[PDB]
Symmetry: D2
């Protein structure tokens, strides 16, 4: 079954689904091997592994190539955190076609104003992309896909930006009506109130995706009770990697020896297995004289 279809089924299923963040081919393979039915191509993680910020410093094609390697290394669908589509509807649909061709299952586009044009840090709510413009962007992507199952998730930034439930609902409905396959409802809060308020008002007009990072103490059954469709574990592999690399690097730096890390890290043979080195060995014996 196509990865696009796999993701689409997840978004539309009656069960709470989960997708795990991965930021490179290696990361993607590990997530797949763990049993996750889906991968979250975190915009934060992809940019951070590259050493750059998540402000579209890396080009959209550079992001796409990272995801191409991720897609090549996984059988489960990857939902790409594509920010706002890297431009207008045209850049978004072009991105969609490229993701589609590389095997990526869907793209998550957010209704934030892009790029940042001013710098005002008052208490005001932050203006977002015009609703009709973003709805038309969603429509353009849906209209441009060649795989009817490719998914477009519309991330509503109303709560994050300082607006309220009414703005969140209006945007969610506009994007869902524009054809979004799911709505990712997000919040900056350390509790699930925004999510709760939205789900109550949403009346299940379509699948809802959430990112519990800040309110991670919330019992997962509470999301099920609310009919949430999918949970995204957004950036934990990247955060775990940094801890390990920082710890491993300092230890070696301090010891000028490998004695205190050798027993704490996977073997090199485990690395070869993750690269599927044996498939190549077999291939070499078959295709080389």
């Amino acid at each position: 079954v196509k990865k696009t279809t796999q993701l689409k089924q997840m978004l539309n299923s009656k069960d709470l689904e989960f997708i795990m963040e991965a930021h490179n081919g290696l990361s993607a393979r590990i997530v797949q091997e763990a049993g996750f039915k889906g991968i979250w191509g975190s915009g934060l993680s992809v940019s951070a592994q590259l050493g750059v910020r998540a402000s579209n410093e890396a080009s959209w094609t550079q992001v796409v190539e990272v995801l191409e390697f991720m897609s090549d290394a996984s059988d489960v669908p990857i939902l790409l955190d594509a920010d706002t589509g890297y431009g207008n509807f045209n850049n978004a649909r072009r991105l969609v076609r490229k993701l589609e061709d590389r095997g990526v299952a869907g793209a998550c586009l957010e209704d934030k104003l892009f790029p940042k044009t001013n710098s005002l840090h008052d208490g005001r709510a932050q203006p977002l992309a015009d609703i009709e413009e973003f709805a038309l962007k969603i429509k353009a992507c849906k209209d441009s896909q060649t795989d009817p199952d490719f998914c477009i998730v519309a991330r509503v930034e109303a709560f994050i930006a300082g607006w309220g439930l009414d703005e969140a609902l209006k945007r969610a409905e506009a994007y869902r009506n524009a054809g979004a396959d799911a709505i990712l409802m997000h919040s900056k809060k350390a509790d699930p109130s925004d999510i709760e308020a939205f789900m109550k008002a949403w009346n299940n007009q379509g699948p809802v995706v959430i990112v519990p990072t800040k309110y991670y103490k919330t019992p997962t059954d509470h999301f099920r009770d609310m009919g949430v469709s999918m949970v995204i574990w957004a950036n934990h592999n990247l955060r775990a990697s940094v801890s390990a690399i920082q710890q491993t690097t300092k230890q070696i730096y301090d010891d000028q020896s490998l004695v205190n890390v050798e027993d704490k890290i996977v073997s090199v043979k485990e690395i070869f297995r993750l690269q599927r080195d044996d498939e190549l060995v077999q291939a070499e014996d078959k295709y080389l004289p």
Copy 2:
């Protein structure tokens, strides 16, 4: 001081120097922050993070771009594990110019036959690149660099391939005479005998670089006693990352919650700091109205 010069000084200094493996921009930054004077752009790690094998599946330009991101994220020199130069002398010197332009400090080229043309698994020693050909490849790289301090490290595979000290010495001397800035003498052994045998016979004709991965129990002072110039901690950040990602992924998969990983990984704010998010914030306040 230029990164090339930084690396060159390290190779020629009277002290045992160390460089730590890094496989992406994030990794490179962490190694730098830890205090390492140099970074080892591991061929194994770069390919593995991409989810592919270390058999030049990723193109040389794809490797170069990974290193471009690494170089952009570090001030210390990166010595790239460039396998055999991805082709003949011409591909090697072209690679050298691109690495040079991206800020990479040096390239390590090995005298293995590339690409693998046959598959015979007998006990015979494995044939390597013709000595004159490889020496000429080294010469071409040295002759093509526009930065006189860019470094070319010649990795001698004689011991690994099954040949002995005499072949290792002959190759080392030929490459050193061809202008190699240092000789990386490697072995597959779980003890330092090959390294010991070579250093005894080498009579310090030039800097020697080693990779203690398999004989990591060896006391580091023993390398100093032998006059080794540099130690490469080859792949430990990649191996540490995989352990963390595998552990973190399984935990979340099992718990369907973040409660058991949140306290074990770096915060998201630590990720922003590694991306130098504050420099951008400052820049936005200065360059945006």
Copy 3:
């Protein structure tokens, strides 16, 4: 009707087919609008447009990227001249998988030693890739396609390398038996004698592709008579482009004016048409608020 299938039908059709060289997205669209049923992604042309030599200087992914834009800009199949596959069978199949993914219809691989290991130029015949190695490379490529109709064309370098017909025949049969969709038989003669000799000895064991650049005075019907499946017009758009650019640049350099070129070149409106600018104009009208 996938491009792969289109190219495959052309190779297996009963008529002499023709593919025109193109080296970028722009020339690919022009070749298509001209009515050509196929495009030749020339190694000489693609490397030349980039300003590098045709010796694997640009990486295979940079080449694939050029081909991606060409594929996007054309509805007809593109057959890429992929040298030897940029490495061994593994590099070759990964290349095929990437070309498939981007809409490229086929790849032409040649059996020469790669990369160059020595510079001896004595009159001797140049050694080629080991017949079995290359045959297995072809098989590895066929075995790894996800699209059954993707085409692998095997170019035999025997005549060019100095070997005779026997060796040209041996290699071709070997590559055909390995699964090549067609054999590209080439020679460095200014006459079609190597081709006539091979076609006679071949005995229609498979579609044969030729490049008549050097023996261009040979009537095309002669190729139909020999039962040649396809002809490649290998590099004339690149050569024509260079002539035009040199003359135009020279004219402007000398005149310090555009007066003597403006009437000899396409208008800017034609460029916009070739870019399909109007489609975007239409899309903005539909997808951007008023």
Copy 4:
């Protein structure tokens, strides 16, 4: 003499300078061999050769990559038409840093709204990027160059956008004050009236670059009289290339022969020369065993 410096001296020289458009490594080398002291990395040409529209469809890194091959194939400075910098000041400076690193000598940024947010076509004058935003973008670019001589040219869209001379002057002064090495003043008229009006009001506050594509009948000496620093021949190699490719492809399509093109296009030997194939031949002789 770095390319950056070369381009900068041209912008600040007392003579009317000229840069020829090129869109790939091949045309860049041709422009150079013709004697042009500079190259115009046209946004129209680069996007067109790729077969896409000039609306930021190809990513900035794909554009930079094309420019990298162009830089490698030329010894004279290339001024890249970088639209608006592909985003805000941050995307613009990262672009400048990458262009510097690859040998590109300068970047031309324009003050139009990017990307397009709406499709209203009422007669109204089109709004542009906020003058302060763009000025700060220019400054951010100047502030981030590692090479002091890298050039930032600011293209003013006021006349084209429907605004008058006052606004064209306001923007230009603003961008010049921010540190632009030159101002590219453009108009969509078939006469140089907008340029004459601006040059008169400008009062030589800085080098001015123009593109006389639309008013090409205007004597070039007239631009010298106005004190114009540089002229850009914006897209004639691309236009000439398209003419040549269409004719050549058509000729071959109709004749199913190369007979009527072989004598009208450059020989293959000229392509090898342009690729500098002989240098590689010489290098192999020296670096490959016998």
